[PDB]
Amino acid sequence: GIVEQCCTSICSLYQLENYCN
């Protein structure tokens, strides 16, 4: 999930926008 991609590992603008409505 988002925690695995952005918290435990370095986040990115690409991944963050995957969770926008």
Added chain:
Amino acid sequence: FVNQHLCGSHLVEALYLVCGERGFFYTPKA
């Protein structure tokens, strides 16, 4: 501000800035 380790309120804050008026969904257990 997006290219780092983002956890908890720091992560929700990032989603807020990035997604804007579109809004977002935060699912830490999914």
